[PDB]
Amino acid sequence: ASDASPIAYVNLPQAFVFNVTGDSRDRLVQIKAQLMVRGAENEELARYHSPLIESSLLSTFASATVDQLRSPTGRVELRDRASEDIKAALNAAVGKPVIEKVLFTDFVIQ
Amino acid sequence: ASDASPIAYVNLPQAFVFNVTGDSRDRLVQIKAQLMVRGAENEELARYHSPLIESSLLSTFASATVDQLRSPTGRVELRDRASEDIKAALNAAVGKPVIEKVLFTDFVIQ
Protein backbone atom coordinates (compact mmCIF):
# COMPACT_ATOMS: atom_id res chain seq x y z
CA ALA A 1 0.00 0.00 0.00
CA SER A 2 2.44 2.57 1.36
CA ASP A 3 5.32 0.39 2.40
CA ALA A 4 4.66 -2.61 0.20
CA SER A 5 5.98 -2.33 -3.37
CA PRO A 6 8.29 -5.14 -4.33
CA ILE A 7 9.97 -2.96 -7.00
CA ALA A 8 13.70 -2.28 -6.63
CA TYR A 9 16.46 -0.89 -8.84
CA VAL A 10 19.91 -2.52 -9.24
CA ASN A 11 22.43 -0.01 -10.49
CA LEU A 12 24.84 -1.04 -13.19
CA PRO A 13 27.58 1.51 -12.34
CA GLN A 14 29.81 1.36 -15.43
CA ALA A 15 28.42 2.75 -18.68
CA PHE A 16 28.43 0.46 -21.72
CA VAL A 17 30.65 1.69 -24.53
CA PHE A 18 30.71 -0.18 -27.82
CA ASN A 19 31.30 0.28 -31.50
CA VAL A 20 28.51 0.37 -33.99
CA THR A 21 29.60 0.10 -37.62
CA GLY A 22 27.83 1.82 -40.50
CA ASP A 23 28.26 2.60 -44.18
CA SER A 24 30.32 5.74 -43.48
CA ARG A 25 31.11 5.59 -39.80
CA ASP A 26 32.28 3.36 -36.99
CA ARG A 27 30.80 5.25 -34.00
CA LEU A 28 31.07 4.83 -30.24
CA VAL A 29 27.85 4.51 -28.25
CA GLN A 30 27.65 5.10 -24.49
CA ILE A 31 24.67 3.71 -22.54
CA LYS A 32 24.09 3.97 -18.78
CA ALA A 33 21.72 1.26 -17.54
CA GLN A 34 19.95 0.06 -14.39
CA LEU A 35 17.90 -3.07 -13.72
CA MET A 36 14.30 -3.00 -12.51
CA VAL A 37 13.37 -6.02 -10.39
CA ARG A 38 10.38 -7.17 -8.28
CA GLY A 39 11.17 -8.54 -4.82
CA ALA A 40 14.18 -9.16 -2.59
CA GLU A 41 14.94 -12.63 -4.08
CA ASN A 42 15.14 -11.27 -7.65
CA GLU A 43 17.22 -8.32 -6.47
CA GLU A 44 19.76 -10.61 -4.81
CA LEU A 45 19.92 -12.78 -7.95
CA ALA A 46 20.40 -9.72 -10.15
CA ARG A 47 23.28 -8.39 -8.04
CA TYR A 48 24.88 -11.86 -7.88
CA HIS A 49 24.62 -12.61 -11.62
CA SER A 50 25.54 -9.20 -12.90
CA PRO A 51 28.74 -10.35 -14.75
CA LEU A 52 26.39 -12.54 -16.78
CA ILE A 53 23.87 -9.71 -17.12
CA GLU A 54 26.53 -7.21 -18.22
CA SER A 55 27.77 -9.65 -20.88
CA SER A 56 24.25 -10.20 -22.19
CA LEU A 57 23.75 -6.45 -22.55
CA LEU A 58 27.04 -6.00 -24.43
CA SER A 59 26.04 -8.75 -26.90
CA THR A 60 22.65 -7.16 -27.56
CA PHE A 61 24.18 -3.72 -28.09
CA ALA A 62 27.12 -4.78 -30.28
CA SER A 63 24.52 -6.29 -32.66
CA ALA A 64 22.87 -2.98 -33.18
CA THR A 65 23.23 -0.97 -36.37
CA VAL A 66 23.56 2.65 -36.90
CA ASP A 67 20.26 3.38 -38.47
CA GLN A 68 18.60 1.08 -35.96
CA LEU A 69 19.86 3.49 -33.32
CA ARG A 70 18.78 6.46 -35.48
CA SER A 71 15.19 5.18 -35.75
CA PRO A 72 12.59 5.68 -32.99
CA THR A 73 11.11 2.24 -33.70
CA GLY A 74 14.69 0.93 -33.72
CA ARG A 75 15.43 2.21 -30.23
CA VAL A 76 12.28 0.67 -28.73
CA GLU A 77 13.27 -2.66 -30.43
CA LEU A 78 16.75 -2.59 -28.94
CA ARG A 79 15.49 -1.65 -25.49
CA ASP A 80 12.99 -4.54 -25.43
CA ARG A 81 15.52 -6.98 -26.91
CA ALA A 82 18.06 -6.03 -24.23
CA SER A 83 15.57 -7.02 -21.51
CA GLU A 84 14.43 -10.20 -23.27
CA ASP A 85 17.99 -11.34 -23.90
CA ILE A 86 18.78 -10.97 -20.20
CA LYS A 87 15.68 -12.91 -19.18
CA ALA A 88 16.65 -15.68 -21.58
CA ALA A 89 20.23 -15.88 -20.32
CA LEU A 90 19.12 -16.05 -16.66
CA ASN A 91 16.47 -18.66 -17.46
CA ALA A 92 19.15 -20.84 -19.03
CA ALA A 93 21.55 -20.30 -16.11
CA VAL A 94 19.23 -20.28 -13.05
CA GLY A 95 15.81 -21.07 -14.39
CA LYS A 96 14.35 -17.68 -13.62
CA PRO A 97 13.94 -14.51 -15.65
CA VAL A 98 14.99 -12.48 -12.64
CA ILE A 99 14.48 -8.97 -14.01
CA GLU A 100 11.44 -6.96 -15.01
CA LYS A 101 13.33 -4.95 -17.62
CA VAL A 102 16.49 -2.93 -18.33
CA LEU A 103 16.22 0.84 -17.83
CA PHE A 104 18.35 3.22 -19.87
CA THR A 105 19.17 6.46 -18.17
CA ASP A 106 21.69 7.97 -20.59
CA PHE A 107 22.48 7.47 -24.28
CA VAL A 108 25.11 9.41 -26.28
CA ILE A 109 26.25 8.29 -29.74
CA GLN A 110 29.62 10.04 -30.28
CA ALA B 1 -8.38 17.68 -0.55
CA SER B 2 -5.31 15.58 -1.56
CA ASP B 3 -4.33 17.94 -4.30
CA ALA B 4 -4.14 20.54 -1.53
CA SER B 5 -1.18 18.81 0.13
CA PRO B 6 1.93 20.97 -0.05
CA ILE B 7 3.96 21.29 -3.24
CA ALA B 8 7.55 20.12 -3.27
CA TYR B 9 10.18 19.83 -5.99
CA VAL B 10 12.38 16.81 -6.61
CA ASN B 11 15.52 17.83 -8.44
CA LEU B 12 16.75 15.58 -11.22
CA PRO B 13 20.41 16.64 -11.04
CA GLN B 14 21.75 15.21 -14.33
CA ALA B 15 20.66 17.07 -17.46
CA PHE B 16 19.23 15.02 -20.31
CA VAL B 17 21.45 15.00 -23.40
CA PHE B 18 20.15 13.18 -26.47
CA ASN B 19 20.42 13.35 -30.23
CA VAL B 20 17.65 14.13 -32.66
CA THR B 21 17.71 14.16 -36.46
CA GLY B 22 15.36 14.13 -39.55
CA ASP B 23 14.34 16.24 -42.64
CA SER B 24 16.06 19.34 -41.18
CA ARG B 25 19.16 18.18 -39.35
CA ASP B 26 21.10 16.05 -36.97
CA ARG B 27 22.17 17.72 -33.71
CA LEU B 28 22.04 17.65 -29.91
CA VAL B 29 19.56 18.61 -27.20
CA GLN B 30 20.10 19.39 -23.53
CA ILE B 31 17.10 19.45 -21.15
CA LYS B 32 17.39 20.13 -17.40
CA ALA B 33 14.34 18.93 -15.47
CA GLN B 34 12.71 18.67 -12.05
CA LEU B 35 9.56 17.01 -10.72
CA MET B 36 6.66 18.85 -9.11
CA VAL B 37 4.93 16.68 -6.50
CA ARG B 38 2.34 17.16 -3.75
CA GLY B 39 2.91 15.68 -0.31
CA ALA B 40 5.61 13.81 1.56
CA GLU B 41 4.59 10.34 0.34
CA ASN B 42 4.64 11.32 -3.34
CA GLU B 43 8.02 12.98 -2.78
CA GLU B 44 9.59 9.89 -1.23
CA LEU B 45 8.11 7.79 -4.06
CA ALA B 46 9.50 10.15 -6.72
CA ARG B 47 12.96 9.88 -5.18
CA TYR B 48 12.85 6.08 -4.75
CA HIS B 49 11.65 5.47 -8.35
CA SER B 50 14.11 7.96 -9.89
CA PRO B 51 15.70 5.29 -12.16
CA LEU B 52 12.32 4.55 -13.71
CA ILE B 53 11.49 8.27 -14.00
CA GLU B 54 14.81 9.14 -15.67
CA SER B 55 14.39 6.24 -18.08
CA SER B 56 10.86 7.34 -18.99
CA LEU B 57 12.11 10.88 -19.68
CA LEU B 58 14.94 9.63 -21.93
CA SER B 59 12.42 7.42 -23.78
CA THR B 60 10.14 10.40 -24.32
CA PHE B 61 12.91 12.66 -25.62
CA ALA B 62 14.38 9.91 -27.85
CA SER B 63 11.13 9.82 -29.87
CA ALA B 64 10.95 13.57 -30.51
CA THR B 65 11.50 15.30 -33.94
CA VAL B 66 13.91 18.20 -34.59
CA ASP B 67 10.86 19.85 -36.16
CA GLN B 68 8.84 19.44 -32.92
CA LEU B 69 11.59 21.08 -30.91
CA ARG B 70 11.56 24.10 -33.13
CA SER B 71 7.77 24.62 -32.76
CA PRO B 72 6.53 26.40 -29.61
CA THR B 73 3.46 24.17 -29.82
CA GLY B 74 5.64 21.07 -30.05
CA ARG B 75 7.53 22.01 -26.91
CA VAL B 76 4.40 22.22 -24.76
CA GLU B 77 3.40 18.94 -26.39
CA LEU B 78 6.77 17.38 -25.50
CA ARG B 79 6.49 18.54 -21.87
CA ASP B 80 2.95 17.13 -21.52
CA ARG B 81 3.94 13.82 -23.12
CA ALA B 82 6.90 13.58 -20.72
CA SER B 83 4.61 14.08 -17.68
CA GLU B 84 2.08 11.60 -18.98
CA ASP B 85 4.70 8.95 -19.76
CA ILE B 86 6.09 9.19 -16.19
CA LYS B 87 2.64 8.94 -14.65
CA ALA B 88 1.85 5.92 -16.84
CA ALA B 89 5.15 4.22 -15.86
CA LEU B 90 4.56 4.79 -12.16
CA ASN B 91 0.86 3.82 -12.41
CA ALA B 92 2.02 0.56 -13.96
CA ALA B 93 4.69 0.07 -11.32
CA VAL B 94 3.04 1.11 -8.01
CA GLY B 95 -0.50 1.98 -9.07
CA LYS B 96 -0.24 5.74 -8.52
CA PRO B 97 0.92 8.60 -10.77
CA VAL B 98 3.20 10.07 -8.11
CA ILE B 99 4.04 13.33 -9.76
CA GLU B 100 2.14 16.45 -10.66
CA LYS B 101 4.19 17.34 -13.69
CA VAL B 102 7.79 17.56 -14.83
CA LEU B 103 9.40 20.99 -15.17
CA PHE B 104 11.99 21.97 -17.80
CA THR B 105 14.29 24.61 -16.37
CA ASP B 106 16.73 24.53 -19.36
CA PHE B 107 15.90 23.65 -22.92
CA VAL B 108 18.43 24.14 -25.64
CA ILE B 109 19.05 22.82 -29.09
CA GLN B 110 22.69 22.97 -29.83
Numbering used by the authors:
A (entry chain B), B (entry chain A): 58 to 167
What do the study authors state?
FliLPeri was immediately digested into a fragment composed of residue 58 to 167 that is named FliLC, and FliLC is highly resistant to trypsin digestion. Thus, we concluded that FliLC is a core region of FliLPeri and that the N-terminal 17 residues (residues 41 to 58; FliLL) act as a linker connecting the TM region with FliLC. The FliLC crystal belongs to the space group of P61 and contains two molecules in an asymmetric unit. FliLC consists of a single domain with a bean shape containing four α-helices (α1 to α4) and one β-sheet composed of four β-strands (β1 to β4). The β-sheet is highly twisted at the middle and therefore can be divided in two subsheets, subsheet 1 (S1) and S2. S1 consists of β1, β3, and β4, and S2 is composed of β2, β3, and β4. The two molecules in the asymmetric unit of the FliLC crystal are related by 30° rotation around the crystallographic 61 screw axis with a translation of 1/12 of the repeat along the c axis; thus, the molecules form a helical tube with 121 screw symmetry along the c axis in the FliLC crystal. The neighboring subunit in the FliLC crystal is slightly tilted compared with that in the FliLPeri ring, resulting in the formation of the helical tube rather than the ring. The interaction between the subunits related by the 121 screw symmetry is almost the same as that in the FliLPeri ring except for the lack of hydrogen bonds between T162 and Q71 and between D163 and V74. FliLC shows remarkable structural similarity to the SPFH domain despite the low similarity of amino acid sequence.
FliL, a component protein of the flagellar motor, is known to enhance the motor performance under high-load conditions in some bacteria. A flagellar protein, FliL, which is a single-transmembrane protein with a large periplasmic region and associates with the flagellar basal body, has been found to be important for the function of the motor under high-load conditions, such as the highly viscous environments in some species. Polar FliL is composed of an N-terminal short cytoplasmic region (residues 1 to 17), a single transmembrane region (TM) (residues 18 to 40), and a periplasmic region (FliLPeri) (residues 41 to 167). FliLPeri shows a remarkable structural similarity to the stomatin/prohibitin/flotillin/HflK/C (SPFH) domain of stomatin family proteins, some of which are involved in modulation of ion channel activities in various organisms.
